Amino acid sequence: GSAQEEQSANEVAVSYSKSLKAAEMDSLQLPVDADGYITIFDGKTFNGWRGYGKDRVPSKWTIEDGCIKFNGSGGGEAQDGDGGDLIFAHKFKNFELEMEWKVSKGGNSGIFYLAQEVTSKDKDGNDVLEPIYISAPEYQVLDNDNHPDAKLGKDNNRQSASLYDMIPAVPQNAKPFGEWNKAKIMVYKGTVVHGQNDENVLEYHLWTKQWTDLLQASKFSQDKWPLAFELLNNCGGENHEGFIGMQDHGDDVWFRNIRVKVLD
């Protein structure tokens, strides 16, 4: 029948949550292509998106020219002002995400996945929000030629599309600052693959001895950061699932064409 009815036919109900650790008790009708990718950013609104830990989108995240933009002040991990990491508030388990990203000269951001909203108790019994990165693996987003982090870590494991500070992207086929790069993150039954610019650049396996050993060699080791170790070692929590999101690392960055295929 109508264009409206055909559109409703080529759409799927996608649950989302509205605030810290809330149930996903509302749904968006989102477009799906023939390959099964759900477009999760519509080019115009933040529907389904919110700050990690928040009930709203921080004002440092804007929409511009069909992109999600983070507007940075230059303070790295500080997350000053009305910032913070952004999530699409729908937990995925087995999925393939594709999106494009572009950084400013010298810029740094990241794509998080399998994220959990985590709090801990302070000395007075009050809940405190823990960083997204103590639960969520990080796909690096970087100007590999100008941000000095590119030269740090080991074997270029802090360059774009790396599992940040843990496993390097090989080949390192990033395009330079100001150009669009294509990211792929696939999680399927614990196998994780990163892609960049239509090439697979690393592979790893969650919930294995090898994964534990990698974490024990990281800043999230059991000795250095017990809570992070516990969360990452059983990445995704009891149900092995979580949110996709993007990082406030204080620098201008743009994201577009954000789509996710649910794998079974």
| Interface with K ion (CB under 5 A) | 46, 108, 110, 249
Min separation Cβ 12 and K ion, Å: 19
Min separation Cβ 257 and K ion, Å: 19
In the complex with K ion, the residue whose CB is nearer, 142 or 186, is 142
Min separation Cβ 125 and K ion, Å: 31
Nearest 5°: the CA angle 132, 202, 235 is 35
Min separation Cβ 47 and K ion, Å: 6
Output the DSSP codes for 197-255.
TTEEEEEEETTSHHHHHHHHTSTT-TTT-HHHHHHHHTTTTTTT-EEEEE--SSS-EEE
In the complex with K ion, the residue whose CB is nearer, 46 or 204, is 46
Min separation Cβ 228 and K ion, Å: 16
In the complex with K ion, the residue whose CB is nearer, 28 or 263, is 28
Is residue 181 exposed (0-12), middle (13-18) or buried (19+ Cβ within 10 Å)?
buried
Please answer whether residues 26 and 15 qualify as being in contact, where contact means their C-beta atoms are separated by less than 8 angstroms: yes
Q: How many helices (H) and strands (E) does the chain have?
A: 3, 17
Half-sphere exposure of 12 (CA within 13 A, CB side): 15
Nearest Cα residue to 192 out of 161, 225, 158, 155 = 161
In the complex with K ion, the residue whose CB is nearer, 108 or 116, is 108
Min separation Cβ 112 and K ion, Å: 9
Residue indicated by tokens 């406030």: 248
Strands 95-103 and 199-205, sheet pairing = unpaired
In the complex with K ion, the residue whose CB is nearer, 108 or 135, is 108
Min separation Cβ 48 and K ion, Å: 6
Distance CA 50, CA 17 (A): 9
In the complex with K ion, the residue whose CB is nearer, 53 or 110, is 110
Please answer whether residues 183 and 101 qualify as being in contact, where contact means their C-beta atoms are separated by less than 8 angstroms: yes
Query: Encoding tokens for residue 8?
Result: 């409703």
In the complex with K ion, the residue whose CB is nearer, 85 or 241, is 85
